[PDB]
Amino acid sequence: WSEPLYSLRPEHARERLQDDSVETVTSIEQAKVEEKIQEVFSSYKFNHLVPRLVLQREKHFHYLKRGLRQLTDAYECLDASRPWLCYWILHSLELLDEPIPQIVATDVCQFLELCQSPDGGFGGGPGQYPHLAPTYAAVNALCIIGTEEAYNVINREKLLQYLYSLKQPDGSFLMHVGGEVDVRSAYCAASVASLTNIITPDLFEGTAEWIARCQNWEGGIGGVPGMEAHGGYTFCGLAALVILKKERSLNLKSLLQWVTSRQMRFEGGFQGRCNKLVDGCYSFWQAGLLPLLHRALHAQGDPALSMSHWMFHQQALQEYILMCCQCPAGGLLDKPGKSRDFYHTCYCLSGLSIAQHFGSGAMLHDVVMGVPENVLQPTHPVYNIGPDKVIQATTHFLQKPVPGF
Amino acid sequence: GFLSLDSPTYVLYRDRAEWADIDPVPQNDGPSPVVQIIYSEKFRDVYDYFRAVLQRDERSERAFKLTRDAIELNAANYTVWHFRRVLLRSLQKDLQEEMNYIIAIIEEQPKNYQVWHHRRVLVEWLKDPSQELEFIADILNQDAKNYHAWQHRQWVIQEFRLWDNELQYVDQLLKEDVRNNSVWNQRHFVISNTTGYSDRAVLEREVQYTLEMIKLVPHNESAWNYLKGILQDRGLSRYPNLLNQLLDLQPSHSSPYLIAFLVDIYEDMLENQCDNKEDILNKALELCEILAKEKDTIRKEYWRYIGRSLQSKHSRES
Ligand SMILES: CCCCCCNC(=O)Oc1ccc(C[C@@H]2CN(Cc3cncn3C)c3ccc(C#N)cc3CN2S(=O)(=O)c2ccc(OC)cc2)cc1
Numbered sequence: 265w266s267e268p269l270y271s272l273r274p275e276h277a278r279e280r281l282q283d284d285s286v287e288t289v290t291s292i293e294q295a296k297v298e299e300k301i302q303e304v305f306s307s308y309k310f311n312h313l314v315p316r317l318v319l320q321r322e323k324h325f326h327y328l329k330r331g332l333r334q335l336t337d338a339y340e341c342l343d344a345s346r347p348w349l350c351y352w353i354l355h356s357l358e359l360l361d362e363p364i365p366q367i368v369a370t371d372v373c374q375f376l377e378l379c380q381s382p383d384g385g386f387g388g389g390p391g392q393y394p395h396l397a398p399t400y401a402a403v404n405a406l407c408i409i410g411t412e413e414a415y416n417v418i419n420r421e422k423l424l425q426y427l428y429s430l431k432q433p434d435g436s437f438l439m440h441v442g443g444e445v446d447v448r449s450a451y452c453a454a455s456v457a458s459l460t461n462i463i464t465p466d467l468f469e470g471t472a473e474w475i476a477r478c479q480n481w482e483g484g485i486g487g488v489p490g491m492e493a494h495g496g497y498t499f500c501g502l503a504a505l506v507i508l509k510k511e512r513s514l515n516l517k518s519l520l521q522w523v524t525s526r527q528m529r530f531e532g533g534f535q536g537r538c539n540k541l542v543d544g545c546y547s548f549w550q551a552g553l554l555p556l557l558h559r560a561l562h563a564q565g566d567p568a569l570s571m572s573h574w575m576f577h578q579q580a581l582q583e584y585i586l587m588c589c590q591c592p593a594g595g596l597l598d599k600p601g602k603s604r605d606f607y608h609t610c611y612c613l614s615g616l617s618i619a620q621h622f623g624s625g626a627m628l629h630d631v632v633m634g635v636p637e638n639v640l641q642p643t644h645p646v647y648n649i650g651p652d653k654v655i656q657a658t659t660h661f662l663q664k665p666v667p668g669f
Numbered sequence: 670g671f672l673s674l675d676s677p678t679y680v681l682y683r684d685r686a687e688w689a690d691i692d693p694v695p696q697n698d699g700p701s702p703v704v705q706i707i708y709s710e711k712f713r714d715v716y717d718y719f720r721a722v723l724q725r726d727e728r729s730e731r732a733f734k735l736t737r738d739a740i741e742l743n744a745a746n747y748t749v750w751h752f753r754r755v756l757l758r759s760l761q762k763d764l765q766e767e768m769n770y771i772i773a774i775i776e777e778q779p780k781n782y783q784v785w786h787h788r789r790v791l792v793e794w795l796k797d798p799s800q801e802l803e804f805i806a807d808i809l810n811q812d813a814k815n816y817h818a819w820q821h822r823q824w825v826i827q828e829f830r831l832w833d834n835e836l837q838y839v840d841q842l843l844k845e846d847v848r849n850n851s852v853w854n855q856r857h858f859v860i861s862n863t864t865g866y867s868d869r870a871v872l873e874r875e876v877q878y879t880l881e882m883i884k885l886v887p888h889n890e891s892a893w894n895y896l897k898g899i900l901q902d903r904g905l906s907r908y909p910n911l912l913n914q915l916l917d918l919q920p921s922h923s924s925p926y927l928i929a930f931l932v933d934i935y936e937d938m939l940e941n942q943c944d945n946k947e948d949i950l951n952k953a954l955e956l957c958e959i960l961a962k963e964k965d966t967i968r969k970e971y972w973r974y975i976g977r978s979l980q981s982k983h984s985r986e987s
């Protein structure tokens with residue numbers, strides 16, 4: 265009689281868009297997606313079968329194992345982002361509990377070595393100039409591997425010089441020399457600096473306050489001061505402030521009201537901005553804010569915080585990802601009718617994990633929709649690598665002094 | 670002087686006589702590559718020659734034309750854009766001609782960062798914003814929510830102090846799509862950098878416009894966020910007519926957004942020690958649980974937290 269799946273319940277039909285008989289581009293586009301998603305939800309009834317949600321682990325594994333080695337010319341557009349592809353693919357395998365052969369581990373290491381610039385940082389491929397984005401990916405990939413060889417690839421002295429060469433007077437960082445600033449650049453710098461123990465007392469002077477200038481009237485964070493609030497930039501902003509221990513710079517209440525409002529009542533997934541469309545990659549960028557806010561608000565003694573669940577619909581997000589974001593041939597995607605890619609595979613899986621695992625001190629509590637085999641390894645909400653990979657990396661680099669001390 | 674990449678008579682660089690003096694530089698991926706992209710012949714050929722001119726630092730007209738093709742094949746390659754800028758300066762290239770180029774490429778690939786940054790560098794070299802607002806308005810007419818387009822517009826308006834006609838643009842677009850959250854954000858950007866909201870004539874005008882938009886489209890969340898946005902850091906309870914006016918909308922214009930705004934009003938009242946705590950407090954909880962259980966269950970965990978934080982600090986307690 266009862267329906268275990270929230271999206272399939274009779275009541276759920278009431279969550280459809282009310283357009284008040286005023287049609288605009290944005291309402292027409294939202295209605296189209298909801299029509300498509302409703303077909304997906306309904307297909308069990310129409311075909312007269314019992315629903316069972318399974319994460320197609322074997323299909324995803326084959327897709328990733330192969331991509332780690334070879335990519336079609338569809339990825340020409342990502343030829344300046346090869347360290348990103350290493351990170352997205354390696355993180356997806358770590359989430360699926362698939363070990364990395366020592367062989368491929370060493371081949372990734374040697375490839376990333378080739379991407380490293382003599383003046384510090386990593387570029388998008390061999391011989392390319394350095395940029396903060398591929399620097400982040402490269403450092404994260406190397407930490408996922410987590411061997412001594414991997415740690416030893418990184419030139420910490422040059423890395424620090426490189427970060428200084430990008431730091432601006434107003435607190436901000438350029439993405440690369442001759443590039444411009446972004447909230448993302450602050451996160452990339454803080455992520456890489458904190459993991460490899462190279463944070464000097466003045467490196468991030470002004471940075472918390474520059475980030476705080478990016479929070480707007482909406483509650484969320486834009487890419488630069490004055491710009492609309494967006495999930496990817498909000499993730500980067502809050503996570504950078506967590507690393508700097510400056511979360512308090514933000515209005516956390518307006519921030520919480522903002523993210524939580526970004527979950528779609530019908531689809532169950534998240535949108536990136538208000539009045540735009542659901543997309544699977546925001547499973548991570550938006551939902552990953554919730555574990556960061558929880559820990560923030562707990563550190564101020566908020567006694568009203570749940571001890572079993574994050575402040576989003578964990579079940580509805582899982583249902584979106586599992587029913588709407590899997591490609592049957594393997595890999596994951598933005599929404600039904602889009603093409604699979606390694607980026608969405610990474611962030612859809614990261615989002616699924618977040619949704620499955622609550623943790624607040626001694627309190628641990630899982631929610632696993634569908635078959636119990638669907639459980640993933642946990643991910644650290646700041647760095648989006650395994651929490652074990654974070655401890656271990658931070659410990660190893662704490663053995664050395666901040667250059668030069 | 671150019672041979673287009675989609676020309677039926679396009680020829681690979683390795684088959685061009687003008688390039689015979691130079692040896693291409695194949696990509697070094699090592700003896701056992703990872704994430705190895707199986708490039709098309711055309712892509713590999715352009716990039717083998719780009720590597721050669723980059724490594725020799727050849728600052729020539731032929732190198733400049735080659736950056737064009739390299740960019741067209743991967744417009745995210747920031748190394749090629751940097752070299753192209755070095756070449757524009759060394760060759761003393763005409764920067765209006767290069768402006769004409771970047772306009773065409775942005776039109777084709779409007780969601781690329783490198784392309785907008787390049788335009789910015791050109792505008793700052795030339796000290797000339799005169800084409801910008803009209804150009805951007807053309808991109809926004811195709812996608813009114815393009816993030817890079819809105820950001821370039823803000824930068825332009827800020828650096829060259831071009832505020833005078835922007836609120837009018839905002840009004841035009843809000844009429845085209847009143848749910849466009851980028852336009853609501855641009856409204857706030859203009860007002861807060863011109864007259865400000867710490868006024869009456871302006872403010873009252875803003876609250877009135879919004880309540881009027883809310884009435885036309887009660888489930889448009891953008892207007893609701895704007896209303897809250899322009900009132901909230903003063904304290905919602907500073908405006909005592911607002912409660913009653915919202916309650917008057919409910920029986921004909923109800924939404925989870927209206928009820929949620931009611932709860933924000935009650936919370937500020939409670940924080941500023943209004944008249945009649947338990948009265949106000951209980952109204953709020955009633956609402957919280959209506960949203961959690963019935964009207965906004967996707968947020969059940971948030972609304973149960975709000976119900977909880979409230980009780981925790983505005984009950985009868987000492
Ligand atoms: C390692 C060198 C990197 C050089 C800079 C890369 N940029 C960066 O680090 O900052 C970022 C800025 C934006 C992104 C997100 C985009 C998002 N997209 C497009 C997208 C995602 N969801 C909906 N959409 C439309 C995608 C899409 C697919 C893939 C894959 N695989 C990767 C991205 C990552 N980037 S993107 O700008 O590099 C990009 C945009 C459009 C594309 O066409 C499909 C491909 C990539 C990621 C990083």
Ligand SMILES: CC(C)=CCC/C(C)=C/CC/C(C)=C/COP(=O)(O)OP(=O)(O)O
Nearest residue numbers: 397448451496497536537540541543816817
């Ligand atoms: C660490 C790092 C560099 C992270 C990346 C952060 C990130 C996700 C940035 C997004 C930038 C952007 C222009 C989004 C708009 O996309 P859109 O309009 O195509 O999609 P949308 O409509 O859903 O916003």
Ligand SMILES: [Zn+2]
Nearest residue numbers: 543544545598
């Ligand atoms: Zn996406």
